[PDB]
Amino acid sequence: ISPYKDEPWKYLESEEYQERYGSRPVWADYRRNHKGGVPPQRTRKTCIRRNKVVGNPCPICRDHKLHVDFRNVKLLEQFVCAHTGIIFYAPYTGVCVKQHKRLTQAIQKARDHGLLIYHIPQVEPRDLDFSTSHGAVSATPPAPTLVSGDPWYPWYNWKQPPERELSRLRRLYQGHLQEESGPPPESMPK
Amino acid sequence: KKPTFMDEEVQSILTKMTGLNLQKTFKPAIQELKPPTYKLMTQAQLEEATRQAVEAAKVRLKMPPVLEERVPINDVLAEDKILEGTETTKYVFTDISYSIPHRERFIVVREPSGTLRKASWEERDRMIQVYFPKEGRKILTPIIFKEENLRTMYSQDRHVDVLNLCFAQFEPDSTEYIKVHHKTYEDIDKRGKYDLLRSTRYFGGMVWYFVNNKKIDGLLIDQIQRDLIDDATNLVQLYHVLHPDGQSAQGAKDQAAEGINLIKVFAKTEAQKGAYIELTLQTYQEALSRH
Amino acid sequence: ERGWSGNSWGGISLGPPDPGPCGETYEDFDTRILEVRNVFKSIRVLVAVGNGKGAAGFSIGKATDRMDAFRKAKNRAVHHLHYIERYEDHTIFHDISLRFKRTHIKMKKQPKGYGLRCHRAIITICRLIGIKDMYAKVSGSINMLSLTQGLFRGLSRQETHQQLADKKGLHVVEIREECGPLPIVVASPRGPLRKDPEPEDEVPDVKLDWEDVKTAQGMKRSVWSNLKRAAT
Amino acid sequence: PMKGRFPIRRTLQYLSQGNVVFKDSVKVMTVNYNTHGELGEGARKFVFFNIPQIQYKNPWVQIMMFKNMTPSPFLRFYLDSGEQVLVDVETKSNKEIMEHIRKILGKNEETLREEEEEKKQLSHPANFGPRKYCLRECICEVEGQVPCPSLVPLPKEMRGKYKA
Amino acid sequence: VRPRLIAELARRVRALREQLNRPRDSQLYAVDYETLTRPFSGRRLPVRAW
Amino acid sequence: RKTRHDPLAKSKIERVNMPPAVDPAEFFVLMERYQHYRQTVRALRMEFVSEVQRKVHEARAGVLAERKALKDAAEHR
Amino acid sequence: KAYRGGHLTIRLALGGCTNRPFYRIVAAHNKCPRDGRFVEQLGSYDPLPNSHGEKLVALNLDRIRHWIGCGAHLSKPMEKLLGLAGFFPLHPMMITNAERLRRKRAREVLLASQK
Amino acid sequence: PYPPLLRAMIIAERQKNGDTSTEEPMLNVQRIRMEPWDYPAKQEDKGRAKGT
Amino acid sequence: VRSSVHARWIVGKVIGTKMQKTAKVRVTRLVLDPYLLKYFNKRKTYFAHDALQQCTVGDIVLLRALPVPRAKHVKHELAEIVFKVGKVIDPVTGKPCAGTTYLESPLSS
RNA sequence: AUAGGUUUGGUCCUAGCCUUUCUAUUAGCUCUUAGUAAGAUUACACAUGCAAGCAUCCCCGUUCCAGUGAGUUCACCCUCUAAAUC
Ligand code: FES
Ligand SMILES: [K+]
Ligand SMILES: [K+]
Ligand SMILES: [Mg+2]
Ligand SMILES: [Mg+2]
Ligand SMILES: [Mg+2]
Ligand SMILES: [Mg+2]
Ligand SMILES: [Mg+2]
Ligand SMILES: [Zn+2]
């Protein structure tokens, strides 16, 4: 149980944090246990599995007072390069994959909320010409059928065939006839 | 006629008023870094390099045009009532022919009612971003442009970052662009942070807004306090040109005011806080005499 | 804390050097073990000391008891300090290629935040010196004493920007991509400025290293390069 | 280290630093130069430094060399029409030779810019396909569109298993 | 490439057989009126023709 | 799919495809609609064909192409 | 490849994933596989509504006109799409299907009234 | 009439090229003669069943 | 569209004249080694129609593609002789020369 | 490769072998749910059922799609020019 869960950043300005870490990042003294001189290229999935911590928890998981929240800006700054603004990959600080994903999401949210500083470049305009006189962005002259309330083409509308042609079709397709259809409803029934 | 923002004379005044600080224009960027290179130079070569940097800064500080808000697009191409009720969602058709300006590009909508109409400005911008993606722009509006996040950005004095984001996201003549730029200018005016925009390409637009809205008192005060008297006088002249029928311009003509006299005439005629303008000018003159 | 390996003496800190008979204290200096060897019995130790502000040295101590060897090496090291010049107090002034006996060292100046991507002994020595951003490649025989000697020789024989400006009598102007075309004058001669420009060498006759060019062109295919590693 | 004097010549950066892109008429370059004699020094340097760049930018043009056949160095260009262009390079520097040949038979910057713009048209940003040819594989990579089911499962109502 | 002569031989003999076995209209367009099938091919005519 | 040399399935040797039933009014209206639609589409198609041919003409023997060629020749001379 | 006859046709090539279809409008030889070799990509079509409740169709109108003028045919779904865009007349079968749907809904309403 | 989008594009092209004509664009079909589907075709071009 | 022969204009050295009215010419091109990024000479033999039989072994000649091949391997015809073996005329000054020395001075004219 | 281990009474050099990293197949032991992607070792032999019709007769199609990797510079560019679409 943390008293800082509601308001995480206070923990970083509390004295206890100052004795524990001082001015150095919370991951400075971590060293990962592995075979060989070349580490594995991915960190462990999660240091907390079914509410049980591993023997060597990562910088975020060892200290339940450290809360990964987009408002905890001073903590998130410790996981971003101050010279390039790039989020460190997980092996760099040893954070587990789960906490690395959470930190990435928190950093992106803090940047989107304007709480975390990042380089915003100056870009050129999209359009060389800003005129809005073309017919694509203006009013096209209405067509006569549109103003008259008529369909664009006359054959869009149903026209009842003359009875002679219908009898001709009935002779041609005798024995394979469906019930004759009348004109459709004027508008779509609901 | 009344001068436009892009007039050569207005452009020259605003260019000189903006200034050119090479250190601020070419401040180090926080980005992926590479090892620097080194060159041995004489004094002449160093001066040539400095002039080339000044030219690059002039290109960088080119002002965005100030445009009027675009009129909404409400145009119907056809109404095929037969299609009414046969579809539940609208169709958006974008013409993606490469060699067409985006403002001449036909983008239409077939609604469930059967109406074939022209796409609105917001739909046009969204579709252009979808099919011709521009670096820095997002299809969905970023939340940074909400009131609270803009207030946070202003609290951090990141007005130039806000304007750069606005330029990247919105078109110059869109409602959102105008609203965000106006809010930034009002914040700068209310907390007197004009120096944030000096040596950038947004200073001219800020000055143009202040002049057309007749609130140049704060900027004039800042320029006097910063000993930029030429800038203050040019601001008064530009104000007179944009408002040639105002009592300030008539007073200047009557009194044959020139130089600081223009500022005094403006302070007595059309200044919301002319008393403080007079006080600051008097202090500046005393300091100049003492120095 | 452990060293380079669980059972290895290398990399382990020995604490500050003892107060010397001269009467000086060395509380700001840190000591690191670079090698411990059995001499056939006695013990020979190679240690390095450094204050993290450019002053650093190394020494060998021989004794029957290991702790006595540590003390001898540390005390002798503090009295044989090199001063290492650092560009902006984070890296070296230029690329340094050297050969000491059969060991080759290629060191590259790097921007801030790059880190120490170097042989582990080089990482230890650089941390003692105060270099924070550098690349280093060791080739030939990997002999620890030769590595230390060559490293210190090369780092002590680097020419600063001010030295180059005084030698050539010209402004040393730095160009950074993140700063655009702005020219940053990093050094100016104390004496007069030459008015004749440097010969614009159309093609310099420099000795290039095949590995660097191969890396530049994308023909390097090593599965071991650019591997994710812990912060150093 | 890299073998030979001036190894920088054998780097693609140097090879692409060339600025001579010949018009379609040029088919052959014959280069007559003298190994000894100060007046031909630039010509010799032209052979040493700039021929690799010229060939790199013009892979289909036949470049051939001739040594100590004439008292003076010169370049000869054979065009598709059968015309021959002779350029005396004696007393000239190699940079001057480059500038001269660029001026007389090299495509101007404007034509190269139109060629680059024509190239830009082939890779239409709207087209969807393999990353080798297109910016995006699928419309599901566009924000606001229905995402890939590999990453975000579709609602049960949109899946044939629970519609059948 | 080893020339393929059997292919040419097969093509020529097949062409010859075709030109010397051209069916006549009486065979091609005969019909069985009980089953409404072409005896030449065995294919049935469409229902709407029956 | 099957080839011409694959035997017919025994399950469908006695299968006769029966024609669908016809609604006379819809059938007649649909025939007229297809006639009008196809006339319109063929007109549009020949306009597109003529546009393509005209673009080829103006790309080969057009005035602008001729002037560009003359400019190139003049610069070469 | 060489085919015996055939022609170019502008059609819809299906990509995407299971339960998430997406179409590329391509001019291709009619004998080629559906999602195989094509001459040019003339646009795209997302049949699933997006977060704005829109179906997105991109049409390279210039190139579509070029290929129709070069003798390319059109598949029926492509013709219906072009009719919806207003580039062609509404296809006869869109109109007929609309009328059939109107009649079916009218029958359902009459059933409701009868009950 | 032209289809709605084609009509709009034609009018836009005219207006961009400076023309202010209000005459509706029209598609000519007197040259397209609707030939009935049951009109006799060319028996000379038709094929013949192959012997087998 | 003027010829079916790929190589239209090529300069080479005559290495054979043992045929009737046909010269065997050696053509060198520069090919970039993909690994070393150095240019090396690649040689190709061409047959050029010499109606007048004016070629001598060692002279530099220019060949123009025929409209169509006149034989299996004869696809080009001698447009001119760039450098006659041992009888070179300096193109720059127009004077006969022997190697790098003038046989007759330019000032003689 | 940022390298490491291993020859000797001992030091230095050279040199092989191996370790550390990332994939794929198979095997041992162990495995809960959901979405997606991919899926004989064998050009060895195959029971069985399907994979080509359409259409007022003529014609058209079954020469495509689908499969495999046995053989192996028939694939790309230019010239010329049939068949096919318009
Ligand atoms: S790749 Fe687009 S839906 Fe899967
Ligand atoms: K048929
Ligand atoms: K094979
Ligand atoms: Mg251990
Ligand atoms: Mg070894
Ligand atoms: Mg299959
Ligand atoms: Mg196939
Ligand atoms: Mg033909
Ligand atoms: Zn963890």
Please spell the DSSP secondary structure of B98-139, one letter per residue. SSS-TTS--EEEE-TTSEEEEPPHHHHHHHHHHHS--TT--S
**CA B56/CA B36 separation, integer angstroms:** 19
Distance from CA of F19 to the nearest CA of E (A): 7
Q: Which amino acid is at E20?
A: L
Tell me whether G69 touches chain F (CB under 8 Å): yes
Helical ranges in chain A per DSSP H? 9-13, 15-20, 73-76, 90-93, 97-112, 144-148, 163-172
Task: Identify whether the C-beta of residue C135 lies closer than 8 Å to the C-beta of residue C24.
Answer: no
CA B108 to chain centre: 31
C-alpha closest to that of G46 among A79, D142, F76: D142
**Number of inter-chain CB pairs under 8 A, A vs F:** 46
What six digits make up the tokens of A112? 């989107």
Distances (CA, A) of E22 to E31, E39, E42, H50: 19, 16, 18, 7
**CA D5/CA C203 separation, integer angstroms:** 11
Range of the domain at A82: 1-121
Q: How wide is the angle at C-alpha B206 spanned by C-alphas B205 and B210, nearest 5°?
A: 115
**CA B127/CA A126 separation, integer angstroms:** 14
Q: SS3 for D116?
A: helix
Q: How many CB atoms lie within 10 A of CB I59?
A: 21
C-alpha closest to that of D61 among D108, D29, D97: D29
Tell me whether G88 touches chain H (CB under 8 Å): yes
Beta bridge partners of D63: D29
Task: Identify whether the C-beta of residue B207 lies closer than 8 Å to the C-beta of residue B235.
Answer: yes
**CA C49/CA C61 separation, integer angstroms:** 13
C-alpha closest to that of C120 among A37, B119, D84, B226: A37
Task: Identify whether the C-beta of residue C54 lies closer than 8 Å to the C-beta of residue C84.
Answer: yes
Q: SS3 for G13?
A: strand
Place of tokens 């007109």: F43
**Run of H or E residues at G28:** strand G20-29
Task: Identify whether the C-beta of residue B192 lies closer than 8 Å to the C-beta of residue B207.
Answer: no
Contacts for F19 with CB less than 8 Å, ≥ 6 apart: A176, E47, E48
Q: Which nucleotide is nearest to F4 (CA to C1')?
A: J62
C-alpha closest to that of D122 among D112, D110, D132: D132
Q: Do C174 and B36 lie within an 8 Å CB cutoff?
A: yes
C-alpha closest to that of C29 among C95, C68, C79: C79
The edge-to-edge listing of strands for the beta sheet with G20-29 is: B76-79, B115-118, B107-110, B90-95, G54-59, G40-45, G20-29, G8-17, G73-74
A36 burial level (CB within 10 Å; 0-12, 13-18, 19+): exposed
Which chain C residue is nearest to residue D12, measuring alpha carbons? C217
What six digits make up the tokens of C195? 């008015």
Spell out the SS3 assignment of C16-78: CCCCCCCCCCCCCCEEEEEEEEEECCEEEEEEEEECCCCEEEEEEEEECCHHHHHHHHHHHHH
Residues, chain D, total? 164
Q: Which of D140, D142, D154 to mutate to test the pocket of ligand 1 (most atoms within 8 A of CB)?
A: D140
Q: What is the β-pairing status of strands B76-79 and B90-95?
A: unpaired
**CA G82/CA G101 separation, integer angstroms:** 21
**CA A153/CA G82 separation, integer angstroms:** 16
CA C134 to chain centre: 8
Report how many domains make up chain I: 1
Task: Identify whether the C-beta of residue C18 lies closer than 8 Å to the C-beta of residue C75.
Answer: yes
C105 burial level (CB within 10 Å; 0-12, 13-18, 19+): buried
What six digits make up the tokens of I91? 């193109």
B70-101 per-residue burial string, b: 16 or more CB within 10 A, e: under 16: beebebebbbbbbbbbbbebbbbbbbbbeeee
Q: Which amino acid is at B95?
A: D
C11-20 per-residue burial string, b: 16 or more CB within 10 A, e: under 16: bbebebbeee
DSSP C129-173: HT--SEEEEEEE---HHHHHHHHHHHHHTPPPHHHHHHHHTSEEE
Q: How many CB atoms lie within 10 A of CB C52?
A: 15
D164 burial level (CB within 10 Å; 0-12, 13-18, 19+): exposed
Residues, chain E, total? 50
Task: Identify whether the C-beta of residue C17 lies closer than 8 Å to the C-beta of residue C27.
Answer: no
Spell out the SS3 assignment of A25-37: CCCCCCCCCCCCC
Q: Which amino acid is at D164?
A: A
What six digits make up the tokens of C6? 């669980």
D119 strand J contact, CB < 7 Å: no
Task: Identify whether the C-beta of residue B185 lies closer than 8 Å to the C-beta of residue B177.
Answer: no
Q: How many CB atoms lie within 10 A of CB A19?
A: 8
C118 strand J contact, CB < 7 Å: yes
Q: SS3 for H17?
A: coil
I/H Cβ contact: 3+ pairs below 8 Å: no
C-alpha closest to that of C129 among C164, C92, C179: C92
B269-289 per-residue burial string, b: 16 or more CB within 10 A, e: under 16: ebbeebeebeebbeebeeeee
What six digits make up the tokens of B241? 């040109």
* Residue of H1, H8, H22 with shortest CB distance to A135: H8
The edge-to-edge listing of strands for the beta sheet with C171-175 is: B37-41, C171-175, C184-187
**CA G59/CA B95 separation, integer angstroms:** 5
Supply the Cα-derived Rg of chain A in whole angstroms. 35
Residues, chain I, total? 109
What six digits make up the tokens of F13? 């040797």
C-alpha closest to that of A117 among A171, A177, A151, A77: A77
Q: Give A46 Cα–ligand 9 centroid separation in angstroms.
A: 5
| Cα dihedral value F41, F43, F46, F50, nearest 10 | -130
**CA B12/CA B3 separation, integer angstroms:** 13
Q: Which amino acid is at H46?
A: K
C-alpha closest to that of B150 among B140, B162, B160: B162
Which residues 80-109 of chain G have a CB under 7 Å from nucleic chain J?
none
Contacts for B7 with CB less than 8 Å, ≥ 6 apart: none
CA A172 to chain centre: 61
- Ligand 1 first shell, C-beta below 6 A: D 137-138, 140, 148, 150; G 16-17, 20
Q: SS3 for B195?
A: helix
E22-43 per-residue burial string, b: 16 or more CB within 10 A, e: under 16: eeeeeeeeeeeeeeeebebeee
Q: Name the residue closest to J59, CA to C1'.
A: H47
**CA A180/CA F22 separation, integer angstroms:** 9
**Run of H or E residues at B48:** helix B43-60
C-alpha closest to that of C174 among C184, C188, C164: C184
Q: Which amino acid is at B118?
A: K
A160-177 per-residue burial string, b: 16 or more CB within 10 A, e: under 16: ebeeeebeebeeebeeee
Q: How wide is the angle at C-alpha D157 spanned by C-alphas D154 and D161, nearest 5°?
A: 85
What six digits make up the tokens of I62? 């220019």
Tell me whether A178 touches chain G (CB under 8 Å): no
Q: Which amino acid is at C67?
A: M
C-alpha closest to that of C116 among C99, C136, C96, C101: C136
Q: What is the β-pairing status of strands C30-39 and C42-50?
A: antiparallel
Helical ranges in chain E per DSSP H? 5-19, 25-28
Phi-psi region of G27 (alpha: psi -120 to 50; beta: other; left: phi over 0): beta
DSSP B75-98: -EEEE-GGGTTS-SSEEEEEE--S
Q: Give F54 Cα–ligand 8 centroid separation in angstroms.
A: 21
C-alpha closest to that of C187 among C94, C120, C109: C94
What six digits make up the tokens of G18? 């299971």
C-alpha closest to that of D123 among D136, D140, D141: D136
Q: Name the residue closest to J85, CA to C1'.
A: G7
**CA B65/CA H12 separation, integer angstroms:** 26
What six digits make up the tokens of B96? 């993606």
Chain A: touching chains (3 or more CB pairs < 8 Å): B, C, F, G, H
Q: SS3 for G25?
A: strand
**CA D162/CA D160 separation, integer angstroms:** 5
Helix, strand, coil in percent for chain G, rounding step 5: 35, 30, 35
**CA I47/CA A65 separation, integer angstroms:** 87
Of the residues B77, B84, B94, B131, the best mutation for testing chain G's interface (the one with the most G CB atoms within 10 Å of its CB) is: B94
DSSP I6-72: S--EEEEEEEEEEETTEEEEEEEEEEE-TTT--EEEEEEEEEEE-TT----TT-EEEEEE-SS-SSS
C112-140 per-residue burial string, b: 16 or more CB within 10 A, e: under 16: ebbbbbbbbbbbbbbbbbbbbbbbbbbee
C-alpha closest to that of A79 among A90, A69, A71, A67: A90
Q: Give E19 Cα–ligand 1 centroid separation in angstroms.
A: 56
Q: How wide is the angle at C-alpha B49 spanned by C-alphas B45 and D108, nearest 5°?
A: 100
What six digits make up the tokens of E22? 């051209």
Q: What is the β-pairing status of strands C103-109 and C116-117?
A: unpaired
The experimental method behind these coordinates is cryo-EM
Range of the domain at I87: 1-109
**CA A165/CA A159 separation, integer angstroms:** 13
Range of the domain at H25: 1-34
Task: Identify whether the C-beta of residue G42 lies closer than 8 Å to the C-beta of residue G27.
Answer: yes
Q: Name the residue closest to J12, CA to C1'.
A: C143
DSSP D19-74: ---B-TTEEEEEEEE-SS-GGGHHHHHIIIIIHHHHHHH-TTSEEEEEESSSSS-E
**Run of H or E residues at G93:** helix G92-114
Report the atom number in ligand 1 closest to the C-alpha of D147: 3
**CA D86/CA B71 separation, integer angstroms:** 64
Q: Do A181 and F26 lie within an 8 Å CB cutoff?
A: yes
Distance from CA of F31 to the nearest CA of A (A): 11
DSSP A81-96: -TTT--BPPHHHHT--
F25 strand J contact, CB < 7 Å: no
**Run of H or E residues at B231:** helix B229-242
* Residue of G65, G71, G88 with shortest CB distance to F41: G88
**CA C125/CA C57 separation, integer angstroms:** 9
Beta bridge partners of C108: C135
What six digits make up the tokens of A147? 């103003």
Task: Identify whether the C-beta of residue G57 lies closer than 8 Å to the C-beta of residue G77.
Answer: no
A90 burial level (CB within 10 Å; 0-12, 13-18, 19+): buried
* DSSP secondary structure letter of residue C81: -
Give helix A163-172 / helix F24-60 axis angle, nearest 10°.
100
C-alpha closest to that of C61 among C51, C49, C47: C47
Q: Name the residue closest to J55, CA to C1'.
A: E46
**CA I28/CA D67 separation, integer angstroms:** 15
